[PDB]
Amino acid sequence: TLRAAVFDLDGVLALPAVFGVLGRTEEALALPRGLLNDAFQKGGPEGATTRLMKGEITLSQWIPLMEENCRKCSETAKVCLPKNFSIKEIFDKAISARKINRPMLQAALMLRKKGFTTAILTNTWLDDRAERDGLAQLMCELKMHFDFLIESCQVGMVKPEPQIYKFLLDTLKASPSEVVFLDDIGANLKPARDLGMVTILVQDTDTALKELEKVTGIQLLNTPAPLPTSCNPSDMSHGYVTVKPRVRLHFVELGSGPAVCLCHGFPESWYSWRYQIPALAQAGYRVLAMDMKGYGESSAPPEIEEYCMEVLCKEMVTFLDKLGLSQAVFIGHDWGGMLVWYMALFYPERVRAVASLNTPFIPANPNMSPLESIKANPVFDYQLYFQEPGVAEAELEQNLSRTFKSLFRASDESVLSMHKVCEAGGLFVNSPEEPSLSRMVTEEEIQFYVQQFKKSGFRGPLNWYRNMERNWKWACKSLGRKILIPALMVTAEKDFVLVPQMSQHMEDWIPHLKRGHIEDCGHWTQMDKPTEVNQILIKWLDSDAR
Amino acid sequence: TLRAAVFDLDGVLALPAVFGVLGRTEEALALPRGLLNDAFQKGGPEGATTRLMKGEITLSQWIPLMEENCRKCSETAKVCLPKNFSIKEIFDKAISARKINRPMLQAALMLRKKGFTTAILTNTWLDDRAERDGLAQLMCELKMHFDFLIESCQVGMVKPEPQIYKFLLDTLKASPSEVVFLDDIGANLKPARDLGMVTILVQDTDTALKELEKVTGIQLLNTPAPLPTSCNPSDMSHGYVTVKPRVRLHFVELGSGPAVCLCHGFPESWYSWRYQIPALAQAGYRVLAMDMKGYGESSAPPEIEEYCMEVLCKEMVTFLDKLGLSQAVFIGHDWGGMLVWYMALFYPERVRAVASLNTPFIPANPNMSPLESIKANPVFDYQLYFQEPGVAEAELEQNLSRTFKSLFRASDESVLSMHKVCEAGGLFVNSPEEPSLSRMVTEEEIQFYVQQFKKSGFRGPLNWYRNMERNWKWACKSLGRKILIPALMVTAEKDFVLVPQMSQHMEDWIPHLKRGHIEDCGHWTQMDKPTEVNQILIKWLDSDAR
Ligand SMILES: Cc1ccc2c(c1)SCC(=O)N2
Ligand SMILES: Cc1ccc2c(c1)SCC(=O)N2
């Protein structure tokens, strides 16, 4: 019975194969068929290419050796190589054109999700070319999805030498009959078969995956669309910045490029952005996913006034100062979305661009008390229930697992009616003791939130709602301003509190506002519709924040 | 007696003043004298500029109001504004041309170093222009050097209104006679004087500083060249990455731009790069200053083999993987310098560029044992003393303050002769019990190293020297390679162990090697000659790593 799957890189996990560009070049330049492929393999196990593949020499040292082999091959074939013939140019173009074979990667992801140990076994080189970063990026993206990456140039062994196969088996800690081995080179497949491994000769991906699903008994072809890559908290880089004597802010950091600061809502975590963090980093951004003040590993002082927007915004500016960032793009959801609009209004020089999920920008009404304003909308009743210190803390902290399971539900699963909460005497008074698990979350993800909230509970988080008057007075100072930096508003069709229509007048304050809209999406945008959030945010970042 | 100094931004800490470009524009366009300056101040306290300076409106909203004022002023003066007249272009150019007034900043730094509370008090605006990042960067650099930054647009008060002066005094927690106030606008200086503050009208910097040093009694002009900005550990962003189950790596992070990974030597810390971190970040780089394995907040497993180059390099690759970085420029010193050459040889695709301070690249000799090789050079005797587990730990851990004070000394201060250490029976056997403090370090900096080493001591650090055979076998695999990625070798004239001549054959292995050389510099390069290290590294990064 199979428990391990091994994939080659060239022509398997990455296409078009770098091999076959030698063939493609021969055709375009009308060179004798196989001339370049022959110069490539010249000298066989003692040749320059084997030395390269074993890590004896680097790719830049190999280039002139390949050029000498091409000359010797053309001389024997009694032909001439063109005037501007360059091995470097040919290989630069082939490497740059080779991209991840997405359905092969998805199949490897599914097998690993089912308990398989997965590995990449590849004949590759030490890349010291000026354009090596492209291949470094491809390898980084691919490797994270596998248990092991075995590279010929690092192990000093090459396929089809029998030793690399014994080395593979030793690293997998598996007997050969327990292994599926996928390769596009028949000669490299032979020693694995000889050892008793299941082998698949990959020509076209679909046929290879049909063979792969038949032998494993796992559906790999025609599957439902997978969710984006999530985060394993223990595999993240965790950052900590003291913004003032008693306040430290924690964040998770991934990627390179323009800084993108993600600001969660209530009662959430940096982890609410788990589906966005890998996607935004892969899109070419340096992601900083915060634990907002009062949450997770960030400090949670008890005083109400520590959570007014003016103080929270000043602390986020200090956070940027201490990290040495002149700007960040700020993306927020729920309370985080309110904070990001205030960052845009009060600190535009520090905000590269601003985006909000669900939370609209509604200017303060200077002729009405914020308390009156909340009372005017029945769906805001939960905010009145949150006012009295201790009442909501008691209900939310009583049973953490029940709190998160009752809250984190898709539009067609909810049991919480945020209107008439005060009258009912609680958020969960008509909710079960043991809620069913929403299709949006796993038991493990719920337990992560439970563990995070065991540190500080709900006082700090609820305090975000307890500064209405203070926030109103501060917001009134901005009533003559417009938001003129790049801005995105993302509405969720089925958020029954932060309804899309509440955003209808935003263009009066943000004339250049761009929009996104997610159908069949509830309040928990990031986890409800992660694929669609990622598509909207990446498209907007690439056009407006780059 | 004075205890606080307050500086204006425009025309004081930053030059040329944005004011006076209105005058400069009038002259270049042959407009009536003062036309632009009049449109700028139109309506006085009720005018558009005061509204801008109080934060009522943003700079982008103010631009067309200034354009309307210019039209009204030209109409009254019976003149016409040119065809391509643009307030936006004029202000973009003026803001971009304004740079920090370095001697004014140095004077503020010296006063603060002497116990003064320093502040910037400025009439400024909320900048939402597409090019706002330039001013955001300038403000970030300046603000870090002061106790307070008071901006008119954030406080809703403007100079010369008497309220902003009372607000200044309240924030300084000082009586007016205790305050020096420097401004380039005489009208803005008047309320401070009226309150009893010492005031200086800044026209040219030299005269202003003569006035400033006369009134404070502190030398500010003609001073010795200051050291670069250092790091306060508690003000840094601290990052933590688990690279394998029992190993976490700690780093300090500052700046945006290409990742630059700094790798310290023995027995050091991320803090040994304290003078480089702010300078490299200000130069446009994202600095990652490591605590190498075995040090500070990084894990220190006891096993010797956890510290061989192959494992240390694999862990640094995993560190990059977990942070989502396809590459970093690697800069190392002493053992860190040896590691960075090995990163360049084994993982060129992950190394953007490589630089070493003091440590030369010497290929492994496959015909001589590494033990024999160390024995051949008398200055390497300390490495033999470090071999026996427990001997050097006992001597180095006996008195931490004595260890760091004996080690960290300039070339003209040393008491340690690294030849005949085994014979003498120790590194400090002819060193005092209470060494004098080197001119390179403060007591506080020594105590930081003492506190860091209290966690794990010297086992992990000494283990870096205990893998000679393992490192030799691994290095022999790279004997057919050349380092062909961008590389810099920095020699220190007076390092008597890592002598400059030991680097003489490096071009045979690194043909495109660039060099730097520091005269009158001992082993502790970064702290011995920080200004010169910063100049060499920034020049090289900007030409070879950008
Ligand atoms: C805290 C919170 C705020 C708004 C919400 C929810 C929860 S779920 C129900 C919903 O649609 N909106
Ligand atoms: C650990 C260490 C290595 C080399 C050194 C020193 C210290 S100080 C004396 C010197 O010049 N070289």
Coordinates of C-alpha atoms and ligand atoms in Angstrom, one line a residue, chain A residues 265-268 333-335 358 379 382-383 386 406-409 411 414 416-418 427 465 494-498 521-524, ligand 1:
Chain A
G265 CA -11.6 42.9 13.4
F266 CA -13.6 41.7 16.5
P267 CA -13.0 39.2 18.1
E268 CA -10.3 38.0 15.8
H333 CA -11.7 44.2 8.3
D334 CA -14.6 45.1 10.7
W335 CA -12.9 47.2 13.6
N358 CA -17.1 45.2 4.9
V379 CA -28.6 45.8 13.6
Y382 CA -25.0 44.2 19.8
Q383 CA -22.8 47.4 20.2
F386 CA -21.1 45.6 24.5
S406 CA -21.3 30.4 17.4
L407 CA -19.6 33.5 15.8
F408 CA -17.6 32.0 12.9
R409 CA -20.4 30.8 10.6
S411 CA -24.5 33.3 6.0
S414 CA -25.9 31.5 11.7
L416 CA -26.9 34.9 16.0
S417 CA -29.4 37.7 15.4
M418 CA -27.5 40.9 16.3
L427 CA -25.4 37.2 22.1
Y465 CA -16.5 49.5 21.1
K494 CA -24.7 38.8 3.1
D495 CA -23.1 40.7 6.0
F496 CA -26.3 41.7 7.7
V497 CA -24.6 44.2 10.1
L498 CA -22.1 45.8 7.7
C521 CA -20.4 36.3 1.6
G522 CA -21.1 36.8 5.2
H523 CA -19.3 38.9 7.8
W524 CA -16.2 36.6 8.1
Ligands
LIG1 C1 -18.9 41.0 15.5 C2 -19.8 40.8 14.3 C3 -20.1 42.0 13.6 C4 -21.0 41.9 12.5 C5 -21.5 40.6 12.2 C6 -21.2 39.5 12.9 C7 -20.3 39.6 14.0 S1 -21.8 37.9 12.4 C8 -23.4 38.4 11.7 C9 -23.1 39.5 10.6 O1 -23.6 39.4 9.5 N1 -22.4 40.6 11.1

